[PDB]
Amino acid sequence: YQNDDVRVKQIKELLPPIALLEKFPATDKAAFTVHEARHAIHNILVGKDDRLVVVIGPCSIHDTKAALEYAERLKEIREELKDSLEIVMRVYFDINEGLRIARELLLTINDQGLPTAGEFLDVISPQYVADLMSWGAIGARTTESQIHRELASGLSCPVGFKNGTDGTIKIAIDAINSARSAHSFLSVTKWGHSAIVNTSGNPDCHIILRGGKEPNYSAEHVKAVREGLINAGLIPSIMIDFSHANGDRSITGVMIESHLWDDTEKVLRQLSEAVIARRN
Amino acid sequence: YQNDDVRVKQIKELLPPIALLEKFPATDKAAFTVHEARHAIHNILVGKDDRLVVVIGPCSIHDTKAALEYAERLKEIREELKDSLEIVMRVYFDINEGLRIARELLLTINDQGLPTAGEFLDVISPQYVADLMSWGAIGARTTESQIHRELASGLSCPVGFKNGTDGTIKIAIDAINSARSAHSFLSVTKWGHSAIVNTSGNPDCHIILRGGKEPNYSAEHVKAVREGLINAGLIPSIMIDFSHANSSDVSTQLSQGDRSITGVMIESHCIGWDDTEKVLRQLSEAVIARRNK
Amino acid sequence: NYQNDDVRVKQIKELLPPIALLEKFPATDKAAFTVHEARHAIHNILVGKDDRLVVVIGPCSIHDTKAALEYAERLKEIREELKDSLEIVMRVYFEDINEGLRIARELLLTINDQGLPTAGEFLDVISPQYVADLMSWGAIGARTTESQIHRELASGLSCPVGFKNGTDGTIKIAIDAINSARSAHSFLSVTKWGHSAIVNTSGNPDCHIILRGGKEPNYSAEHVKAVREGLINAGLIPSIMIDFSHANSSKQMEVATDVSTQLSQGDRSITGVMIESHLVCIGWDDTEKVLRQLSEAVIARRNK
Amino acid sequence: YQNDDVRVKQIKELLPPIALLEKFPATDKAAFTVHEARHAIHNILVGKDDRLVVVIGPCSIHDTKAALEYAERLKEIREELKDSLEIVMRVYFEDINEGLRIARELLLTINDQGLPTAGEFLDVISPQYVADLMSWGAIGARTTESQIHRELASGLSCPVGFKNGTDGTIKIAIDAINSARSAHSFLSVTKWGHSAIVNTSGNPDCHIILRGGKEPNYSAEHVKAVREGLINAGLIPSIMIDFSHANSSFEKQMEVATDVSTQLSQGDRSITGVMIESHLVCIGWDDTEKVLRQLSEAVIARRNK
Ligand SMILES: O=C(O)[C@]1(O)C[C@@H](O)[C@@H](O)[C@H](O)C1
Ligand SMILES: O=C(O)[C@]1(O)C[C@@H](O)[C@@H](O)[C@H](O)C1
Ligand SMILES: O=C(O)[C@]1(O)C[C@@H](O)[C@@H](O)[C@H](O)C1
Ligand SMILES: O=C(O)[C@]1(O)C[C@@H](O)[C@H](O)[C@H](O)C1
């Protein structure tokens, strides 16, 4: 009585994570870009830093050449606007060749001094690229999932919980809360072997406002959200996603979807000015 | 700079899945009980069998002995009401001793002729006991997750996608629509090794009514769900979870001839064992009644 | 094109991890204590603290486990009867590797759980991870005794080990083997989870020569006198094991008597013997006889 | 009752062989070098090529920069003496994870520079990390009688050399050559680092190395007695003389070269290969040029008698 893998057409072994960490080791320069950017994003998130975190980047990468050019352009503005903004590049995408292409781009961009951001879709793929990640988002459809909250509880970067696909703010405040506590999930070791991951908790989680039924970047949503975070005994630290379905010091970060460029300069220069205006 | 496992307190290697299947191989009775039960649930779901899948069991297992005595009791009712209710037991609970204790119980129960049911919450644990699984539920907090639908696409058992914690039914209709297609998710091999899982599609995916802001077992919800499934081009095979936010009707719906209700979910010894006999006997009578229309 | 890899490999198949073998066939408290007490007892005999002789006796090859488990029951009674004179351990040598490993463990678990200690041979660095927890003694054959890799396997083996003389009668390869094993080494093998690993060793002081014949036999009082002088000149404890079979015999029964006379004369250097015995290679009747004979030769040694 | 790992101080996981082939992927240049060399060595071992195989290299590699300079000089000699000699460099090493990285990066660079590499197979696991870069390999005198070794040779993608015993025993190698030609089985690790069963198809390209013993074994008389030894056994009389080790115990390895060069000139087609231990600063670089040029001239002379 064949009862196993009845609907599995194929199970091919995946290169162990250590094989991507050996083929593509973090340069000291990548390591510091990742390490400084995390601490930066932390200082901004708790209010220690008056600058704004800016996750901007292509909607999706289809060409690594095209992306390395965007990055070159972005790094200039990253440091040109360094005292008003914290610019991070958003890098969304054979799985083995895919994992190699993914890692090489994140390492090259962090070695060029540009910190990288993306989405933590599952609990196994972080073991391959999170050493080069300074920030990540949990999607609207996986915010209420418990494994995605446990995942963040052990992610080494700050984490953005998006709101519900209807516009629910409670699953995010409950997620942010959950991530702050130790947890246990199941994934693999850097050798690729089924393992138990015991977390210590991530205090650097915050909500993303990405829309829903109708947009929610309105001051009144942000006021309702900020009162929602305060009641739950959380730092009112808010990020607004300008894309997808979308002196106030409770807005600590924005999110932008930008391809190859003119309005990107305009928007970054515009938010720069509003950050400067807030210090007064 | 230390940028790795900064928020990891420990990463301990887990027994490979093959080591649970070696320590506890399926008997031919388990093997048979799993295969027959899964085929039965399919026929009941797609309207070839007029019986009703009853997923009943304790809300939580704290003792293995107590659960083995419940299984013995429920097996007797399963054999009696076999021409009205395909009865399946709900089995919800060191991870290695937890995997050992969970596998042994599911084998023992299937080797006793009682098919077992559970909840698939991750993409790794299935590899340890799915061979002993005849049905499974996908929770309300993981029904819009693409990973949990792609898991169901490659699950060898019939799958139940619960509604949302509010009452959303589309996540599940979309879930059922998704599972029916080939997908790909990352999991481990039976040797415990990171892998690419290419699926084929599970056509045996269905909706569960677990309640929400307000219970949804009423005939109209069932009619709505039927119409919502009908509009998505999906068979209106519906299951109502008498428990959860639907407890904090169905029988007469069936007595009157609702063929859409094809399954139920009960949380018993959470009722005690006497009401369990009553409710199974009640629904048995309702399925008998449904055939005379 | 230009296939440069696995050109002469017909198939590579993943073998169960050692953990799947120790999980399906876990040691029992009775099996654990038999291995522990035999390994301690074999050590005390090899060092002179025990006057008893080690007796590694068992079938030439195991094709049937019922036949092996019946020999196990018979041999156990003789182990219990001659316990004050002999340390009897069964030789479990067999000819799907995955099933062969399942069959081998279940056999060693059953025999050690019945209270009979098991002895075998180490031919590889990987197979020990599946069955050595049930091994109270083991051997390094004459064709692997000059191989450092095995000397490093013996350096990290939890059982006392026996190195065999050259297939030509060469003693140096094993006096050198014992010296190497006494040291900490490092050999590549797998974990209990089946993963390529580096094994760091502490050294095994419980390694000893097995006389098994090379060109002509080597069991006479003269070969032992000169093998013992060779261990003494090299600073090694003079503990010797004579295999009555293989080359020393072609008669196991004639070698038994020559060795029994040596023990009766007072040779405390012979601390162990090896016999190849089946039930239906001597038979059960001659096994009782050789065992009862060596027991009386140990009792005689005590008095001289 | 601690019955496990009582004599094990530490067991650490070694990198999967795949982490080494990913970080140090073979180049199309390394691949063609290994491929054409394994095939050139085979044609010389069976008489299809009148050239001689030369396994020459340092005794011990403690510096890659010193080896890479030796590789550069040697390659020019390989290209100059190509019509008379199949020159291959011997790469023998004295954190195993770092030593794996150093070993493979070196064998990759040298095969990428077009110089085929030659080493020794000590165990059944290490191969999986660098054998894709080996054009020849050896089994030493202390493991030639070992089944596990002859089963690994049965499934090696390169021609293999079995050394005689440390007493000078030829049979074990005639028995080693025989066994290796048969299909066998051994337990090793996959390219993913996992416990495995390796089924072999057998290796016809295996031969004897005369490395020494109680006294040397390179005289015309030993080769004659060794070649008759192989003939009886029904085996291609294809012999390899190791000038070093116990055949020369520098100044003697050069006497062994003249002794051997004289037998080849005579016409001994049964000598298909030599082994020389050479360093820069073990003979020096100047003697290496000389001995390669010597053996080249003897091979040239062999074609005329
Ligand atoms: O490949 C997997 O991860 C599975 O989900 C688990 C396995 O045990 C089977 O029963 C499933 O059909 C597939
Ligand atoms: O499978 C092995 O263990 C090998 O030894 C690995 C590598 O050396 C290949 O080239 C051999 O053909 C086989
Ligand atoms: O189990 C042991 O005692 C071992 O000695 C442990 C380790 O050394 C393994 O590699 C050996 O093969 C067996
Ligand atoms: O277990 C994991 O998935 C991680 O690899 C652990 C975490 O601490 C890392 O730094 C990565 O952010 C994710």
CA distance A95 to chain D (A): 15
- Give B266's contacts (C-beta < 8 A, 6+ positions apart): B54, B55, B56, B57, B242, B243, B276, B279
- Yes or no: say if C119 and C75 are a contact pair by the CB < 8 Å rule: no
d(CA B251, CA B264): 10
- C80 three-state secondary structure: helix
- D283 three-state secondary structure: strand
Under DSSP, the state recorded for C290 is: H
- Give D246's contacts (C-beta < 8 A, 6+ positions apart): D166, D211, D212, D213, D216
- Nearest Cα to B219, choosing from B205, B204, B238, B235? B238
- Give B251's contacts (C-beta < 8 A, 6+ positions apart): B282, B283, B285, B286
Q: What is the DSSP string of C23-65?
A: HHSPPPHHHHHHHHHHHHHHHHHHTTS--SEEEEEE-S-BS-H
Whole-number Å distance, alpha carbon C97 to ligand 1 midpoint, is 26
Whole-number Å distance, alpha carbon B124 to ligand 4 midpoint, is 17
- Yes or no: say if B145 and A142 are a contact pair by the CB < 8 Å rule: yes
What residue has token string 């790795």? B4
- Nearest Cα to B128, choosing from B279, B237, B18? B18
d(CA C219, CA C212): 8
Measure CA of the first residue to CA of the last residue in chain D; give whole Å. Answer: 73
Distances (CA, A) of A152 to A156, A161, A199, A215, B148: 8, 9, 9, 26, 18
d(CA C202, CA D9): 6
Closest CA in chain A for residue B164: A144
Q: What is the DSSP string of D287-305?
A: HHHHHHHHHHHHHHHHTT-
The residues that bridge with D194 in the sheet, in sequence order, are: C195
User: Within chain B, how many helices (H) and strands (E) appear?
Assistant: 10, 11
Contacts 24+ apart (CB under 8 A), C62-66: C62/C92, C62/C93, C62/C94, C62/C95, C62/C107, C63/C94, C63/C95, C65/C103, C65/C106, C65/C107
Under DSSP, the state recorded for C214 is: S
- Yes or no: say if C161 and C204 are a contact pair by the CB < 8 Å rule: yes
Interface residues of D toward B, Cβ cutoff 8 Å, are 192, 194
Count of residues making up chain C: 304
What's the angle, vertex CA A216, arms to CA A212 and CA A217, rounded to 5?
A: 140
Ligand 1, closest atom to CA B155?
12
Breaks after residues in chain C, judged by C–N over 2.5 Å: 95, 250, 280
Write phi, then psi, for D273 (nearest 5 degrees): -170, 150
- Yes or no: say if B61 and B101 are a contact pair by the CB < 8 Å rule: no
Q: Quick one: how far is CA C267 from the chain centroid?
A: 21
Structure tokens at C226: 């000169």
CB contact under 8 A, A8 and B165: no
d(CA B198, CA B214): 38
Reduced 3-state DSSP string for B18-48? HHHHHHCCCCHHHHHHHHHHHHHHHHHHCCC
d(CA D15, CA C78): 49
- Give C17's contacts (C-beta < 8 A, 6+ positions apart): B16, B18, B19, B191, C192, C193, C194, D195
Interface residues of D toward A, Cβ cutoff 8 Å, are 13, 15-16, 18-20, 22-23, 192-193
- Nearest Cα to B211, choosing from B165, B159, B261? B165
CB contact under 8 A, D17 and C147: no
d(CA B33, CA B114): 7
Whole-number Å distance, alpha carbon D190 to ligand 2 midpoint, is 9
- Yes or no: say if D162 and D208 are a contact pair by the CB < 8 Å rule: yes
CB contact under 8 A, C4 and D31: yes
d(CA B5, CA A259): 33
- Yes or no: say if D136 and D115 are a contact pair by the CB < 8 Å rule: no
- Nearest Cα to D4, choosing from C293, C291, A69, C199? C199
Mutate to test the pocket of ligand 2, among C9, C15, C189 (most ligand atoms within 8 A of CB): C9
d(CA B58, CA C290): 64
d(CA C14, CA C69): 30
Domains present along chain C, CATH in parentheses: 18-303 (3.20.20.70)
CA distance A192 to chain B (A): 5
Write phi, then psi, for B230 (nearest 5 degrees): -60, -40
Pairing label, strands B194-199, B184-188: antiparallel
The resolution, in Å, is: 2.7
Whole-number Å distance, alpha carbon A149 to ligand 1 midpoint, is 24
User: Within chain C, how many helices (H) and strands (E) appear?
Assistant: 10, 11
- Give D258's contacts (C-beta < 8 A, 6+ positions apart): D294
d(CA C151, CA C179): 9
Structure tokens at A155: 């992610």
What are the residue ranges of helices labelled H in A112-218?
126-129, 146-153, 170-179
- Nearest Cα to D128, choosing from C189, A96, A192? C189
The residues that bridge with D212 in the sheet, in sequence order, are: D246
Structure tokens at C291: 């065992």
Beta carbon of B9 within 6 Å of any ligand 4 atom: no
Structure tokens at B174: 């979309």
CA distance C190 to chain B (A): 14
Count of residues making up chain A: 280
Ligand nearest to the CA of A153: 4
D166 vs C contacts (CB less than 8 Å) = 146
Q: What is the DSSP string of D91-106?
A: --B--HHHHHHHHHHH
- Yes or no: say if B89 and B116 are a contact pair by the CB < 8 Å rule: yes
Distances (CA, A) of A197 to A47, B103, B190: 31, 21, 19
Neighbours of chain D (3+ CB pairs under 8 A): A, B, C
Give the CA count within 13 Å in the CB-facing half-sphere of A45.
Answer: 21
Structure tokens at D27: 């180049």
Structure tokens at D74: 């040697």
Structure tokens at B171: 């996540």
- C79 three-state secondary structure: helix
Experimental method: X-ray
d(CA C56, CA C139): 10
- B258 three-state secondary structure: coil
Pairing label, strands A8-13, B194-199: antiparallel
d(CA C263, CA C242): 12
Under DSSP, the state recorded for C230 is: H
Structure tokens at B243: 């428990």
Q: How many Cβ atoms are within 10 Å of C258's Cβ, its own excluded?
A: 15
What are the residue ranges of helices labelled H in D166-248?
171-180, 220-232
- Yes or no: say if A207 and A161 are a contact pair by the CB < 8 Å rule: yes
CA distance C158 to chain D (A): 5
- Nearest Cα to A101, choosing from A59, A123, A129, A135? A129
Neighbours of chain B (3+ CB pairs under 8 A): A, C, D
The residues that bridge with C273 in the sheet, in sequence order, are: C55, C242
Q: How many Cβ atoms are within 10 Å of D27's Cβ, its own excluded?
A: 14
| H/E segment holding residue A272 | helix A262-279
Whole-number Å distance, alpha carbon D5 to ligand 3 midpoint, is 6
| H/E segment holding residue B103 | helix B95-111
d(CA C90, CA C88): 7
CB contact under 8 A, D18 and A23: no
